[PDB]
RNA sequence: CCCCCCCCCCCCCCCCCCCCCCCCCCCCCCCCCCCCCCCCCCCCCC
């Protein structure tokens, strides 16, 4: 049991408490053990404990003397025990506890008054118990109790007198999840002095019982009310009438299989700010369905509509001016839906929208016409997600109405076209554009001429074509910092492609075909496309098939810190190639054909590093090529993973396999 | 001008005849030179010449004294000269010549009698001349002349008196190709004593002029008659009436753009044995169209039918019982056609067929039903070709009627199915089966159980599946000698796949994935699937990705002569692996990772060879690994191509690039 | 004999990620052949 400040005995197969520990220990963890009983005679030495986790054990019963030896104990964790018997003296001397977790204790019934003797308890948990009533005592106690759990119990009814013991208690979290509760008594929730949160998740209520609960919850200080997986199939206008007299701010209806949402149902929630309806089966949405929610600031509709069926083609249709009431909506999630498309008035009325997500939200939004996003003209949208919508074509002025757009994601689509440059018109504040994993893209001389403020440009695995045009397509991108052109099988690159991009920091060119551009036999000479990038930090050149590196390629990367050259065919490197890399930190040369590591080339590179990866290289165990390398390895501070497992010699055969 | 027995001066830019040659030279070749004139005063030394080729020169005129110095001259080759003037004395002293080629001499008119003085001439050529008449003299000469060319001339008519000089001459080949001849005179061909062959290729005759020619050719000893590219658009029953009185055996109508073949047209050729109709545009074939050809032994119909057109879908249709008259047909070529398919009576009546080719002959023969080849039941067919017919499915008993089939070719198709084994039923005499370049094949335990006599089996690039069944699919193939399983990406092979195939000689397994089966870390041990093949001769294992070879793999290949292991990842080979290869002749190890060549492993292999290919290997210039190799290279007889260009050292760097 | 609670260990299935090897298709470049066209120089014939 290793212990420097806290003691851990997780999965150590301990049966009895250890007797050799420092006296000043604060936390004693004995989880996942086989302690049948816990005598208090062995806790004389341990008198400074604050947290005592004895969960996941076979403890049957305890004794009052246990708390005598722990006067400063604050956490008494008894998760998943066999403690099914409680008495007044069980927690008598214990009064400074701030947590008492008793989950899966198989407690049947609270007998008289076990929790009276403590008053500073903050959190109490009784989940996975056999309790059938919520009574926890006779008189009033647990004044400072903030949260209480009763989930996974056998409670069938809630009586007012059962919770009368909390007449002066502020319950910030009252869990009643997974309870077979079907009856509500008048004034049951009014017994609690300060009620802030309810969680009736996985409780089969139904519209009638939900309406009764809403009526019973009227005129209280409730703040959060979650009804997840409540089997709330249908909603009526009077279902949430009782919530009018409250100040509810967060509501949840997730996984309720809500077949139809009623008309003007949520008119009684003027103070609602957070709304959750994900994973539902709404078939039709009415214009006045969302009436009265003019204060919500967060709406979640992930998979909130019914999925398409070939039997009837029942596509969930959203009526026009549906969101005209959500004036204060600022975050809208609508992923994993099957909406037929965007109409001329689908998003009208959203005057505060800031984040709209439509990932996999449409059955087939193949063409982005200039009138597709007309409804978002008055929405100051900043981040728009359109991934996995099977978009195949983008027309001119597609995003003309999104003047405030900053982040645009069009990846994971089938966008196949040529960027004429007018597709991005109207994006005066765009910063990041994602176009990776498309069908095919064809760049022109003015593909990005209308987005001079762009900073990120991801074009990974998009089959780039005509990137070697005489005018560089990235010339207008003066503020570009991150550029990704990987997995495009790029073959020809002009030497002026990256000219003028002094602010470029991360450049990815892995999984391309640029071997010919660096060979000295290339007609016209080697292509030096890595000149002037004084601010380059991360350079990735994996799987480019390079056979030789010209001497003056890295002559300008003074601020380079991470350089990747793995999976190439490098065999020999010219001397004085890493002198300019005075701030290098990580070097990657795995799976190459390097045989000699000399201080002529790797000297300045290995001046001071943090990572080094040259694992799968056929090194040569010779005094003129490996002596300096092993001498540097002997005394250094750089981290070399798998140094003795993969840095192996191949030649000569006398030293074949020798590290 | 190198010369050991004959003299060659081809493209040597010679202007005058050389004067330093052996006297006993027999052949003097001066082709492609710039000899303006050929004086006979320089031929005093050369008196033993037999063949004198002065073709492709600028010779203008000759003198009779030239033949005086060459009494034993037999070939006087004067191809492509400016000799446009002839006289009686030009070929006076020349009498022992057996060949006189005068093509492209720009001869306008034969004046009086230039060919009288010789009588032993055999071959005479006058192609590409400006002759307008066939007169070659006044009296009769050239008694022993066997062939004569008049192609590419300016002849417009053929008169009987023009060829009267051959009253006692046997012309075995009379070329009149590319002649604008439009008039035929009576008795023109009867002047020649023995006429055996005519070649009117590329002569625009037409049906009427063709009929006139046939009438004029009646009652002669003609044997071959070719009318290739004669613009014979249409044929009538009376077109070839005149050929009845002859004994014609070979006829040609190739490239005639024959739109329609007449009914009962060829009834006048009872002795025809060879028939050519390739590259025609026949649209409809009648049942009685081929009547009277009961003696033809070779029919060619390559692209003899019109191609399909989307405008009208005019697929060339063949009437039933079309070939019922060709009783003696033994070789039928019908490639590059667009026949809709095979009917129930397409090939009925062919009782002597031995070779049927249907490569790219059908528009879409997708399914080979059991009734597809019903017409071939009575044909003793031996070789059948069905390549490039886009066959996609084969049913049971497809080849049940082909009991005499020996070679079957089904490659270059889209055959995708699983071989249940009944597809080959009825092939009791099959020897070779070609199935390469199909869509996908799935083998079972009894895929080839009905073909025990098979000897060749090509399955190259067919995407073989389930080849690793517990019963080897090749078990019934006891007589199998050549097996091809390359380019199938085979991954798993059982050790008993080739058990019982002692007669296997050529085995191909290149472009597969068998690296795991030979690694010593493979669960269950390495797979020794090359045991018992004592008669194996050619072994091909290219691009299998092998990393190590178990010692006892080649312990049984005593008769192995050619072994291929290139394009693999071999780095080191265990000692005593090539001892059993006592009859090895060719070793291939190119593009591997071999670094050391030691006599422990390569000793017995290099005992006596003819070829060695270890070019693109990273050798190691060390006294313990390359000294024996270079010593063996210094004194040996094996052919090592590109020894000084690609056998280069890579390590140590002091000897980097040194051969 | 029954219903539950753990700790340890051994298997089965599914999903995700990564590595090795290989095939097919396509892209970039180079080389070797065949055909056609153009241009330049020189030598002849009518």
Helices (H), A31-87: 65-68
C-alpha B82: how far from chain center: 37
Residue A486 domain boundaries: 481-659
Strand C neighbours among B 341-380, CB < 7 A: none
Q: Are B408 and B434 in contact (CB under 8 A)?
A: yes
Cα dist. B26→B37, B47, B49, B73, B120 in Å?
A: 22, 9, 4, 9, 19
Instruction: Give, in degrees to the nearest 5, the angle at Cα A297 between A291 and A298.
Output: 95
- Contact map slice: A 558-577 vs B, CB within 8 A: 571-572
The 3-state secondary structure of B534-591 reads CCCCEEECCCCCCCCCCCCCCCCCCCCCEEECCCCCCCCCCCCCCCCCCCCCEEECCC
> How many structural domains is chain A composed of?
1
Contact: B651, A620; criterion CB under 8 Å: yes
Q: Are A66 and A37 in contact (CB under 8 A)?
A: no
Contact: A653, B571; criterion CB under 8 Å: no
Asked, for residue A221, whether it belongs to a domain, the answer is no
Q: A544 beta carbon < 7 A from strand C?
A: no
Residue B199 DSSP SS3: strand
Residue A611 DSSP SS3: strand
| Chain B touched by A625 (CB under 8 Å) | yes
Q: Are B58 and B35 in contact (CB under 8 A)?
A: yes
Q: B95 beta carbon < 7 A from strand C?
A: no
Contact: B572, A656; criterion CB under 8 Å: yes
Asked, for residue A48, whether it belongs to a domain, the answer is no
Strand C neighbours among B 448-467, CB < 7 A: 461, 463
Q: Are B628 and B600 in contact (CB under 8 A)?
A: no
Residue A349 CA to residue A428 CA, distance in Å, equals 23
Pick from A315, A309, A235, A237: nearest CA to A283: A315
Q: Which residues contact B310 (CB under 8 A, 6 or more apart)?
A: none
Q: How far is the CA of B442 from the C1' of C24 (A)?
A: 17
Cα dist. A558→A127, A502, A584, A622 in Å?
A: 60, 12, 9, 32
Q: Is A515 exposed, middle or buried (0-12, 13-18, 19+ CB in 10 A)?
A: middle
Q: Phi and psi of B209, rounded to 5°?
A: -65, -35
Strands B367-368 and B393-394: parallel
Q: Are B471 and B497 in contact (CB under 8 A)?
A: no
Q: How far is the CA of A124 from the C1' of C6 (A)?
A: 23
DSSP letters of B281-346?
A: -B-EE-TTTTTT-TT--EEE-TT-BPPP-TTT----EE-TTTTTT-TT--EEE--S--B----TTS
Give the determination technique: cryo-EM
Q: Tell me which DSSP letter residue A56 carries.
A: S
Distance from CA of A459 to the nearest CA of B (A): 33
Pick from A64, A11, A20: nearest CA to A46: A20
Q: Phi and psi of B166, rounded to 5°?
A: -105, 35
DSSP letters of A398-433?
A: TTTT-TT--EEE--SS--EEE--S-TTTT-TT--EE
Q: Tell me which DSSP letter residue A639 carries.
A: B
Structure token pair of residue A226: 């979650």
H/E element, A125:
strand A123-125
Q: Is A41 exposed, middle or buried (0-12, 13-18, 19+ CB in 10 A)?
A: exposed
Residue B445 CA to residue B476 CA, distance in Å, equals 10
Q: How far is the CA of A36 from the C1' of C7 (A)?
A: 12
Residue A536 CA to residue A480 CA, distance in Å, equals 12
Q: Phi and psi of B66, rounded to 5°?
A: -65, -40
DSSP letters of A302-364?
A: TT-BPPP-TTT----EE-TTTTTT-TT--EEE--S--B----TTSSTT-SS--EEE-TT-BS-
Structure token pair of residue A369: 């016409």
Q: Which long-range contacts (CB under 8 A, 24 or more apart) does A132-137 make?
A: A132/A156, A133/A109, A133/A159, A133/A162, A134/A158, A134/A159, A134/A162, A134/A163, A135/A110, A135/A162, A135/A165, A136/A110, A136/A165, A137/A110, A137/A112, A137/A113, A137/A165
Strands in B345-467 per DSSP E: 355-357, 367-368, 383-385, 393-394, 407-409, 416-418, 432-434, 440-442, 456-458, 464-465
Asked, for residue A5, whether it belongs to a domain, the answer is no
Q: A82 beta carbon < 7 A from strand C?
A: yes
H/E element, A368:
strand A367-368
Asked, for residue A377, whether it belongs to a domain, the answer is no
Pick from B507, B501, B500: nearest CA to B483: B507
Specify the CATH number for the domain of residue A524. Answer: 3.80.10.10
Residue A259 CA to residue A250 CA, distance in Å, equals 22
C-alpha B414: how far from chain center: 26
| Chain A touched by B625 (CB under 8 Å) | yes
Asked, for residue A523, whether it belongs to a domain, the answer is yes
Please give the span between the terminal C-alpha atoms of chain A, in angstroms, as a whole number. 36
Residue A4 CA to residue B507 CA, distance in Å, equals 68
Please state, as a whole number, how many other Cβ atoms lie within 10 Å of the Cβ of residue A463: 15
Chain C, protein-covered positions (CB within 7 A) = 4-8, 20-24, 26-30, 43-46
In the beta sheet, which residues pair with residue B102? none
Q: How far is the CA of B178 from the C1' of C34 (A)?
A: 25
A128, HSE (Cβ side, Cα atoms, 13 Å): 11
Q: Resolution, in Å, please?
A: 3.1
Asked, for residue A278, whether it belongs to a domain, the answer is no
Residue A436 CA to residue A420 CA, distance in Å, equals 18
Q: Are A347 and A375 in contact (CB under 8 A)?
A: yes
Q: Which residues contact B642 (CB under 8 A, 6 or more apart)?
A: B615
Pick from A132, A110, A226, A212: nearest CA to A173: A226
Q: Are B152 and B126 in contact (CB under 8 A)?
A: no
Q: How far is the CA of B463 from the C1' of C24 (A)?
A: 9
Structure token pair of residue B372: 């597809």
| Chain B touched by A622 (CB under 8 Å) | yes
* Closest Cβ–Cβ partner in A571, A596, A654 for B624: A654
DSSP letters of A550-568?
A: -TTSSSS-TT--EEE-TTS
Structure token pair of residue A379: 């929405």
Strands A197-199 and A432-434: unpaired
Which residue reads 């839906």 in tokens?
A: A337
Contacts of A622 in chain B (CB under 8 A): 651-652
DSSP letters of B605-642?
A: GGGS-SEEE--S--EE--TTTTHHHHHHHHS---B-TT
Please give the span between the terminal C-alpha atoms of chain B, in angstroms, as a whole number. 36
Asked, for residue A531, whether it belongs to a domain, the answer is yes
Q: Are A267 and A288 in contact (CB under 8 A)?
A: no
- Contact map slice: A 23-82 vs B, CB within 8 A: none
Residue B364 DSSP SS3: coil
Q: B492 beta carbon < 7 A from strand C?
A: no
Please state, as a whole number, how many other Cβ atoms lie within 10 Å of the Cβ of residue A457: 21
Asked, for residue A224, whether it belongs to a domain, the answer is no
C-alpha B395: how far from chain center: 33
Structure token pair of residue B552: 């006892």
CB pairs under 8 A between A and B: 43
Residue A655 DSSP SS3: helix
Of all residues in chain B, the one with the smallest CA distance to A654 is: B624
Q: Tell me which DSSP letter residue A519 carries.
A: S
């Amino acid at each position: 049991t290793v212990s420097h400040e806290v003691a851990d005995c997780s999965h150590l197969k301990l049966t009895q408490v250890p007797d050799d520990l420092p006296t000043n220990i604060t936390v004693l963890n004995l989880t996942h053990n086989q302690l049948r009983r816990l005598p208090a005679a062995n806790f004389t030495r341990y008198s400074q404990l604050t947290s005592l986790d004895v969960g996941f054990n076979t403890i049957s019963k305890l004794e009052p003397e246990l708390c005598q030896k722990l006067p400063m104990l604050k956490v008494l964790n008894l998760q998943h025990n066999e403690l099914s018997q409680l008495s007044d003296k069980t927690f008598a001397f214990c009064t400074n506890l701030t947590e008492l977790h008793l989950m899966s204790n198989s407690i049947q019934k609270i007998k008289n008054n076990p929790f009276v003797k403590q008053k500073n308890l903050i959190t109490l948990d009784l989940s996975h118990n056999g309790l059938s009533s919520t009574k926890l005592g006779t008189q009033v106690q647990l004044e400072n109790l903030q949260e209480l759990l009763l989930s996974n119990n056998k409670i069938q009814a809630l009586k007012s007198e059962e919770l009368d013991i909390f007449a002066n208690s502020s319950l910030k979290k009252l869990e009643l999840s997974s309870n077979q509760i079907k009856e509500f008594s008048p004034g049951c929730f009014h017994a609690i002095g300060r009620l802030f949160g309810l969680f009736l998740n996985n409780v089969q209520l139904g519209p009638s019982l939900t309406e009764k609960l809403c009526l019973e919850l009227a005129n209280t200080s409730i703040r959060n009310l979650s009804l997840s997986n409540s089997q709330l199939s249908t909603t009526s206008n009077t279902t949430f009438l009782g919530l009018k007299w409250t100040n509810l701010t967060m509501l949840d209806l997730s996984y309720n299989n809500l077949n139809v949402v009623g008309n003007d149902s949520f008119a009684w929630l003027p103070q609602l700010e957070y709304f959750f309806l994900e994973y539902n089966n709404i078939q039709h949405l009415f214009s006045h369905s969302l009436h009265g929610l003019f204060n919500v600031r967060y709406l979640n509709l992930k998979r909130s509509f019914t999925k398409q069926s070939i039997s009837l083609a029942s596509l969930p249709k959203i009526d026009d001016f549906s969101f005209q009431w959500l004036k204060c909506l600022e975050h809208l999630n609508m992923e994993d839906n099957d909406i037929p498309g965007i109409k001329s008035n689908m998003f009208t009325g959203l005057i505060n929208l800031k984040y709209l997500s439509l990932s996999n939200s449409f059955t087939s939004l193949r063409t982005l016409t200039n009138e597709t996003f007309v409804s978002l003209a008055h929405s100051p949208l900043h981040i728009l997600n359109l991934t996995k919508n099977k978009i195949s074509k983008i027309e001119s002025d597609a995003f003309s109405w999104l003047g405030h757009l900053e982040v645009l994601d069009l990846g994971l689509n089938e966008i196949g076209q040529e960027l004429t440059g007018q597709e991005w018109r109207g994006l005066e504040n765009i910063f990041e554009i994602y176009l990776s994993y498309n069908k095919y893209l064809q760049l022109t001389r003015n593909s990005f001429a209308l987005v001079p403020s762009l900073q990120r440009l991801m074009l990974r695995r998009v089959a780039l074509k005509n990137v070697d045009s005489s005018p560089s397509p990235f010339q207008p991108l003066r503020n570009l910092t991150i550029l990704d052109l990987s997995n495009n099988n790029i073959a020809n690159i002009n030497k002026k492609m990256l000219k003028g991009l002094e602010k470029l920091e991360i450049l990815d060119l892995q999984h391309n075909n640029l071997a010919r551009l660096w060979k000295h036999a290339n007609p016209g000479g080697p292509i030096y496309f890595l000149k002037g990038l004084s601010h380059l930090h991360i350079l990735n050149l994996e799987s480019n098939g390079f056979d030789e590196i010209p001497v003056e390629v890295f002559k300008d990367l003074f601020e380079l810190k991470i350089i990747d050259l793995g999976l190439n065919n490098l065999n020999t490197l010219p001397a004085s190639v890493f002198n300019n890399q005075v701030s290098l930190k990580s070097l990657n040369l795995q799976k190459n054909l390097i045989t000699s590591v000399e201080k002529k080339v790797f000297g300045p590179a290995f001046r001071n590093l943090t990572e080094l990866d040259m694992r799968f290289n056929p090194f040569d165990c010779t005094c003129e090529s490996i002596a300096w390398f092993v001498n540097w390895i002997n005394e250094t501070h750089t981290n070399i993973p798998e140094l003795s497992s993969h840095y192996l010699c191949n030649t000569p055969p006398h030293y074949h396999g020798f590290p």
